[PDB]
């Protein structure tokens, strides 16, 4: 009932301001023909009422996936997005959000032999949006399990703290794959939300209402 007090200019407030303004920047509003004044202001407010909140949705999916992907790089923790139902469940849910948005631009009726081939390539982006997040979080972590099993075979067989130039070259290769996994954790949360603005932004187009009567000169 009593909300907490926020310092202005906090670092999480500055990061999320720049993050939100980035994903809002991906589907910008289109400039009308008329100058924007008090005549055109309800047409601009109604143009914003009919646009999807892709600025909010894409930073929902940025912040929920970069938090899940970076959990896999914390010790004692696995990424939730290395699960098949989690990662592909976010990809189908973006694709269904784009489709529900594109189906409502009409009256919820679904759109010769061409259109089964536009549909297939369109229905596969349900699969590809989530599987790309799942495979990247699985295939990077699986290779790290294999190469740290093979790196453990050397000090198990040889001495502890002995014949160290053999294990050093594979402990730096293991260390450089965890570092690549930090890059893939941030990139795949970016590629998921860049592509969510592209897919949802395809149906983010309505008619500008505008002035139907004008006193010229």
């Amino acid at each position: 009932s009593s909300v907490r007090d926020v310092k202005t200019g906090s670092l999480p407030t500055n990061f999320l301001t720049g993050v939100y303004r980035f994903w809002r920047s991906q589907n910008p509003a289109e400039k009308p023909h008329d100058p924007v004044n008090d005549r055109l202001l309800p047409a601009v407010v109604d143009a914003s009422d009919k646009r999807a909140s892709i600025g909010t949705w894409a930073t929902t999916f940025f912040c929920t996936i970069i938090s899940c992907n970076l959990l896999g790089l914390m010790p004692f923790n696995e990424a939730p997005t290395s699960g098949l139902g989690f990662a592909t469940g976010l990809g189908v849910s973006v694709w269904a959000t784009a489709t529900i948005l594109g189906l409502s631009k009409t009256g919820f009726k679904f759109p010769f032999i061409f259109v089964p081939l536009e549909t297939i390539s369109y229905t596969f982006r349900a699969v590809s949006l989530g599987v790309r997040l799942w495979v990247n979080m699985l295939a990077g972590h699986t290779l790290l399990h294999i190469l740290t099993g093979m790196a453990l075979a050397l000090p198990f067989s040889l001495g502890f703290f002995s014949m160290v130039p053999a294990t050093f070259g594979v402990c730096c290769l293991l260390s450089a794959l965890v570092g690549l996994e930090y890059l893939v954790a941030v990139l795949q949360s970016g590629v998921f939300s860049i592509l969510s603005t592209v897919y949802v932004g395809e149906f983010n187009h309505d008619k500008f209402i505008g002035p139907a009567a004008k006193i010229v000169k």
Binding site: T8, N14, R21, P75, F76
Partner: protein
């Protein structure tokens, strides 16, 4: 709590001319804003103990099931590989350059406030 300019105006009006210039530092301090003083510490809040015991209850539970995972020595040596980058990030990230880089992501902190330019609001 009425406003402090009307407290300045009232408290300057009811002083004599002889003690005007002596009173001006106690009228200045009566209308200064409150900056609350550094209280007693009483550290680690009731929710900061849930956060630290709950993270220790999570780390012990995840290390418990990692140790019987059929690749337990491979799992437990991955926490060494993952915590090595948490150590190598405290020693390589420029934390003052990162603080001022996030500070420029927000337009509220990328510039100074801009209104009210002091020649428009004089009272002569």
């Amino acid at each position: 709590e009425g406003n402090s300019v009307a407290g300045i105006i009232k408290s300057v009006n009811e002083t004599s001319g002889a003690n005007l210039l002596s009173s001006l530092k106690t009228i200045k301090a009566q209308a200064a804003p409150i900056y609350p003083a550094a209280a007693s510490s009483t550290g680690y809040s009731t929710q900061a103990k849930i956060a630290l015991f709950g993270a220790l209850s999570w780390i012990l539970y995840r290390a418990d099931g990692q140790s019987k995972a059929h690749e337990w020595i491979v799992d437990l040596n991955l926490n060494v590989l993952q915590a090595a980058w948490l150590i190598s990030f405290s020693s390589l990230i420029p934390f003052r350059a990162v603080y001022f880089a996030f500070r420029g992501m927000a337009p509220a902190t990328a510039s100074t406030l801009n209104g009210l330019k002091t020649f428009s609001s004089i009272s002569l």
